[PDB]
Amino acid sequence: VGVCPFVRYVNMMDLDGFTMGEVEYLVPVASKIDKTDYDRLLAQHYNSWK
Amino acid sequence: VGVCPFVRYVNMMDLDGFTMGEVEYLVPVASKIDKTDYDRLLAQHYNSWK
């Protein structure tokens, strides 16, 4: 081929080299939503009836 | 035929080989809805009247 035959598809262009993906960038928010849903599930599983 | 006569219909294209279906991908959410309905059924079957 003449060079390494691999071409890289970069998600975000950055001068610092940080190849950032949409998943690891938003982990805390998704985990926060999951924790809120878990709290609601616990509330309706343990404290939902008189 | 010349090759194996089967052609595969992939639901999701992935470079990691994960053939993901719409059912097993959304099991937790459907089970969550079912559990909420079950909680409501228990509430109206045991704690619905004075």
- DSSP structure string for B1-50: --S-S-----SS--TT-----TTTTSHHHHHHHHHHHHHHHHHHHHSS--
| Helix or strand (DSSP H, E) at A27 | helix A27-46
Residues in chain B with CB shorter than 8 Å from the CB of A44 are 36, 39
**CB-side neighbour CA atoms (13 Å) of A22:** 2
Q: How far is the C-alpha of B5 from the C-alpha of B9, rounded, in Å?
A: 13
Query: Are A41 and B35 a contacting pair at CB < 8 A?
Result: yes
Method: cryo-EM
Query: Closest by alpha carbon to A25, among A11, A39, A7?
Result: A11
CB contacts, 8 Å: A50 with chain B: 47
From CA A19, how far away is CA A49, in angstroms rounded?
Answer: 49
Q: What is the resolution of this structure in A?
A: 3.7
Query: Terminus-to-terminus CA distance in chain A, angstroms?
Result: 74
Helix axes A27-46, B27-46, angle to 10 degrees: 20
Q: Which residue has the tokens 């194996």?
A: B4
Q: How far apart are CA A32 and CA A35, in angstroms?
A: 5
Instruction: Note whether B42 and A48 are within 8 A (CB).
Output: no
